[PDB]
Design a binder for this molecule. Structure first.
Ligand SMILES: CO[C@@H]1[C@@H](O[C@@H]2O[C@H](C)[C@@H](O[C@H]3C[C@@](C)(O)[C@@H](O)[C@H](C)O3)[C@H](N(C)C)[C@H]2O)[C@@H](CC=O)C[C@@H](C)[C@@H](O[C@H]2CC[C@H](N(C)C)[C@@H](C)O2)/C=C/C=C/C[C@@H](C)OC(=O)C[C@H]1O
Ligand SMILES: Nc1nc2c(ncn2[C@@H]2O[C@H](COP(=O)(O)OP(=O)(O)O)[C@@H](O)[C@H]2O)c(=O)[nH]1
Ligand SMILES: [Mg+2]
Ligand SMILES: [Mg+2]
Length: 299
């Protein structure tokens, strides 16, 4: 249960947004924020991002820093440009296009806007464009802000540490743990460069036009300079090896950092997705996600 119309009106009013109530539309796809789309009495349309829990707004500090960087240096895609930003409300103008898919909590999966039964080649190609562009923003510009910046070995040690931490808290199935460790311990599989990543790339953030060309990305709380591989994970989860291959190919061809074992490395990172599920469980405190994490970790 989240905020209702009258509550949203009051939050918006406190922030000098005076909404036309009949235009208010709720979008509940986000685990961290309630989203509202609404037009104000000035005829101006808004996205209103309303935090669901105490842990949410503290994670937006880096987000704003990352958006400043991406809005300044990105040329071929849009990102939110926040107009209002307080501990109670973030607001910005809606990006062009529509999300390639959006989570429906009644089924626990996506309602797709693209033909999931035959994904357009332009979607992989253009996501490749967007990611290579993003990942090329100079790391020194991120270091001058409070963003996390990993060298390539720091990215590896960060993964080692995060795994150790989840094992200590939850346990980890022995076979899963051995798989993780064999990946960590295989020098040849790791990237030798890092870049600025989005960190939570998925269909629900990937804005597309009528041709399934990606034109924008929302939700930048996980941006940092680290292993670029994270931004390929959803393509593997949703579209399998073939979809991962298509995205890698496009990224490589347009100038993105590539190394010989990139695909295999990404697949291992996917096998380590339970680390991320566990971390969400701990950060959010949501009991169902603790259960999910234990299942995912094969405890
Ligand atoms: C986008 O990823 C998605 C993930 O959503 C992400 O889940 C990560 C673990 C979170 O990231 C983590 C790691 C971190 C390092 O980023 C950390 O800083 C951050 C705090 O948390 C991250 N957000 C918080 C950054 C969040 O968007 C889940 C949540 C946990 O997995 C979204 C829930 C609505 C889940 O729907 C649910 C309903 C409830 C249900 N179950 C519990 C009863 C469950 C199984 O599925 C829907 C699942 C759909 C599955 C279909 C496949 C194709 O879809 C994908 O693979 C994408 C998803 O996995
Ligand atoms: N179409 C569209 N949807 C948006 C936009 N901004 C946010 N949303 C929706 O609002 C939801 C929640 O916003 P998000 O920043 O992802 O929140 P979080 O996932 O809870 O951290 C997203 O999943 C989208 O469905 C936008 O600019 N356009
Ligand atoms: Mg989101
Ligand atoms: Mg988020």
């Amino acid at each position: 249960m989240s905020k209702d119309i009258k509550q949203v009106i009051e939050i918006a009013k406190k922030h000098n947004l005076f909404l036309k109530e009949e235009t208010i539309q709720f979008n509940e796809s986000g685990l961290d924020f309630q989203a509202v789309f609404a037009q104000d009495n000035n005829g101006i349309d808004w996205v209103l991002r309303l935090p669901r829990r105490e842990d949410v707004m503290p994670r937006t500090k880096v987000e704003k820093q990352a958006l400043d960087l991406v809005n300044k240096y990105a040329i071929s895609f849009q990102a939110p440009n926040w107009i209002i930003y307080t501990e109670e409300l973030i607001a910005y103008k809606k990006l062009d296009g529509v999300p390639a898919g959006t989570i429906d909590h009644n089924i626990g999966n996506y309602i797709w806007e693209i033909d999931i039964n035959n994904v357009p080649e332009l979607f992989h190609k253009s996501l490749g464009r967007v990611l290579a562009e993003l990942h090329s923003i100079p790391s020194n510009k991120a270091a001058a802000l409070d963003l996390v910046v990993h060298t390539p070995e720091e990215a590896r040690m960060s993964m080692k540490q995060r795994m150790d931490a989840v094992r200590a808290k939850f346990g980890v199935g022995e076979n899963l743990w051995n798989r993780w460790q064999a990946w960590l311990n295989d020098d040849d599989m790791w990237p030798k460069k890092t870049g600025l990543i989005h960190g939570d790339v998925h269909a629900g953030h990937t804005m597309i036009d009528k041709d399934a060309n990606v034109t924008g990305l929302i939700d930048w709380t996980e941006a940092k300079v680290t292993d670029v591989s994270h931004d390929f994970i959803f393509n593997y989860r949703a579209f399998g090896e073939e979809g991962l291959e298509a995205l890698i190919l496009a990224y490589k061809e347009i100038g993105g950092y590539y190394w010989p074992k990139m695909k295999e490395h990404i697949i291992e990172l996917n096998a380590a997705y339970p680390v991320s599920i566990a971390e969400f469980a701990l950060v959010s405190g949501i009991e169902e996600y603790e259960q999910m994490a234990k299942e995912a970790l094969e405890v």
